[model samples]
Target: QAPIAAYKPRSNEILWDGYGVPHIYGVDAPSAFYGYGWAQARSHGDNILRLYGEARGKGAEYWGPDYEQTTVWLLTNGVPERAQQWYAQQSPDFRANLDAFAAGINAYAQQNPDDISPEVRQVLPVSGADVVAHAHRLMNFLGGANSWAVAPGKTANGNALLLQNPHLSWTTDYFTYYEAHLVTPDFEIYGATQIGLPVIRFAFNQRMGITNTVNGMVGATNYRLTLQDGGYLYDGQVRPFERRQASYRLRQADGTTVDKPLEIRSSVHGPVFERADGTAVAVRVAGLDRPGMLEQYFDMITADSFDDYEAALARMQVPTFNIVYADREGTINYSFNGVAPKRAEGDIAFWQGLVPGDSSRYLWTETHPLDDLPRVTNPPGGFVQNSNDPPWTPTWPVTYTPKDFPSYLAPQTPHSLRAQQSVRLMSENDDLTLERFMALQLSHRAVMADRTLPDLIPAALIDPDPEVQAAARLLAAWDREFTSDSRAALLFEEWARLFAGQNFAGQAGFATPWSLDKPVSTPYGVRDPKAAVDQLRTAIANTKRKYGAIDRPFGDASRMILNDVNVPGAAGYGNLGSFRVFTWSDPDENGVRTPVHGETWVAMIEFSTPVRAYGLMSYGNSRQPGTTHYSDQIERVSRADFRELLLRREQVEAAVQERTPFNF
Candidate 1:
């Protein structure tokens, strides 16, 4: 537990570019990791440290009651112990790298105490095990998400293209991405990762690129247990709960701590949570026993070819994600990646809901191996994508079917409006240049508007109310885009909200519901013309009340605000079918809404010679006030502009703002 500097490694340095992104040069992999940790400390010390503490299940002790549930979950799932086991299971080289990463954080905190916030300083001197715990906590919670790729045949340049757009909140701790480029004698990779992670989860190298989106692949299950005699009934017998005790220090309002006890219980399935209805539910997660998730990421970034990349993924350590991949060899792939358990019976819907805990037949202990999972490799259609849709339709002319695999793998549900939009954008273009692909990433066209407006406009046009007719006329003239200056976007959004609220279930309001054969264009026509007209009127009233105008420019109503920079926002909710996704907070008195969640780290990459890449961390790199990068990229986000990413040493050296050397 000595100072981090005491375990000194060889010399390394970080070249902080003009935009506050670090270009780390390490003598070796561990040294590179050390530089990565050091750079993160300087950019996101407070947030990462706080997150690491939360990962340790000590958040309630450090912060307050808000983190009690996180603490309980960690304790209940035995995460603290599992984290150590995972860390110990890591290979010697990666273990050294993990330790080096943690040491860099400690060394920075020790050298510059004033730089870190007091609340998170207690989390300093974190260890390699903390990194594993944080990764586990993070990868487990990563569900919900767009991303697509175009193969060489589909692009004007005959080069593979990818857009890594991870949808997450801009404010939360581990959700925020820190951009960096790591260089060592053996490898070079550039991309962004959640602040506390040691390796880049989404990145591209000279040879290839990879990104993730939340997939519909189910990797966990919950079982509703029949409680009997203080235990749970399982397999016709009353089983005793495996119990463990733990306590947390809850800080009172007066800045004092109080001990709170937690009784953790587990059944044969997994961790058990008690219900007020005299029952218990056991949760089982896939990949919970696997400890090589980060190690897999490390291997992925260093992979030299498509086969090599698949080899890393073959480890099957990552629990869930749709791994969209592209390489310079003109190949693109979409793997509905993760550890999905091989259920004994029933379908995805059955497993998604609570299973009866009384029988061992429903319990699953093994996962589908890598080759068994759904994947698309270089389809003739020349593109593959996923907007969190099932694996069946990631590409055009569905390559796989439910009968081809286990019925419990994924839902046979219709593509979401967002997924439909993604499909439309990719398939609509054939000869796409880098410029065209970038434009596609920023497309404001809403598939919902395109799909439903035809029916909606006509229905409103026939309404007896003159005001309804007027609204219809306005919508008729709309371009079906959510551009910043679009005057009718808010009104349309209001109408869609009311329509969705009225139509509660899947395909509820659609006269011609979604069909599997017609993935992008079905689900058209309003089911109830009168009801649709009513919602339109209601939408006008709601929009007027909210913004003082039914046709206020979308940008004027919502904005991207960070620090002193405030710019008109574009894009909208993915459910509304926007590919350029943006979620906003509630509007203030001035009718100005700010971003809450949606697209965060966005990258447009083409696996051509030298690997051209461009992107922006929508909220910038540093959270610290007065730092140059606090909100540096907000304007770029507003304008849908991307800064060229510097991966090569020459490109990075040209933009160096500061260079810090370290020996650790």
Candidate 2:
């Protein structure tokens, strides 16, 4: 009778390190996910709730008109209904784990109500389906930075290196990443995932490391409708739009909720958005029928080898990304990983624009399979890299070409400045040391400056205005990097923006436009010298007016500032061709610019024994205002420094700031 009364509890633990990273230990995968959910809720509960509410297509009810479009988009795609199907499609074991994850989030909110926002609390007791819904929303609303894989031959230590750099909007609910280390008896993985996501997309285990870069794969298309009598022509016949009526609650400033009616229309393509010209355009996106995206990510993270990882990739559940892989076996691979619509006829560029709705021939009902998608393994160059460029140039002496694959897979465009920089770094460094590799990750050399300065300087030297010549000389003497103290960088950045606007891809406004044969060198000179000098004079005046001095250091204007931590930000825009990329906000009253997005979760892993890794979350871990981690990493990132990632249980336990135990 005494033995019957005694209960044995399952052991589960979460250790939070000093940097606010969660190190989770569990008896099984389900319990591990529970800790993940609990930690996520504790740190980012408010944001997660907001995200989940929006994912459920109820943002308008909670946050007001600001999120009305979000609700419309979700409902238009039938995300909420499909999310339930996605949850049901989960395998029994994975479903249990997902349920445990949602339960943990509920437990956190239930036990610590004050920690969550009062308004967001209405989304309490979220289900595994809600989790699936959030993931689905994130997947469907896709679309940066860059990632590269270096084979053992390219590394001095005879171990492969994988660089994971995701440049995204830093403050958004969907873009922010949460760092963690999950350990179970079967596997130990360390990495970061977007907040509210159950599994890590950029992650590494002992055997392999994987990272993703936004790819150029066209996953969605719009069909221009020929409307007549409230119907659109399809297959040369008039077909009535699938219409529906819906309403959403909008919150007023006085906190009163008002109902707003919404009308939705759909065609065979998908949802219809009307044009002012009395016509409509219908959109169709891929991977709507595929619901095992999270399952595939789970498999990828837990895989033991290249074979296992490739098997997971073959699922093609993830709608889009250029996945770069490196493993302990000294192998490197790149896959243009996505579900690309297999159109009957057209190139990527042709399909990107609005197609004729009158013909059934333009409709893409099926996507290209894994075998048809572009992938390369162990290229002779010993490196594979992507800076959001197409699949053609992952390596020099390229493994695959656009002509080899369907033209609709990816566009044939010249590499961006950042992509050229990526290849330059990988190609120049034949035997990369870990320290050297880390340095390369923080390289701030502005590729655009390097390419354009030669022409601009000479051209400006011949300019009529003394100010133009002075600015040209200033640029000539500069190091062509976005270092904090570089005064010329500020002037050049302004000049480039004024001169080229946003055409930094070296496509136009160049003496010699980008050519496939000379990808890295062709787009080198200014097209109009006198006009460039005019822009230079304008830039000089603009810089002086903005900064009160043309010689103000880049640091004085661009800074990394959050709630408390403020420091000199050294990174530059990827569009400007800086490898140390950052999307920055416009200048405030004092001319201080802060990062808007770019370089969110950055990790560089060496697949040596025990899998050594170094990285940092630029925005820190927690989003809660008072938490120490909310903006702690700003200083480190400003200095281009990285913290060694804690992977082993013992290492993480040594640095534990708090330890929480649970039982299942």
List, residue by residue over 440-553, the lDDT tens digit for candidate 2: 988778778877887788888988778777888889999888888998988988888877684444346778877878876757778887888888888888888777777789
Point out the worst 10-residue segment of candidate 1 by lDDT: 1-10
In angstroms, the error of model 2 at 404 is 0.6
**What's the C-alpha lDDT at position 93 in model 1?**
95
Per-prediction TM-score, please?
0.95, 0.96
Task: Please give the range of 10 consecutive residues that has the lowest summed lDDT in model 2.
Answer: 1-10
- Writing each residue's lDDT as its tens digit, candidate 1 over 106-153 gives 998988899999888878789999999999887774324677789988
RMSD of each: 4.4, 4.4
TM-score of candidate 2 relative to the true fold: 0.96
- The per-candidate count of clashes, in order, stands at 0, 0
- List candidate 2 stretches off by more than 4 Å: 1-10, 252-261
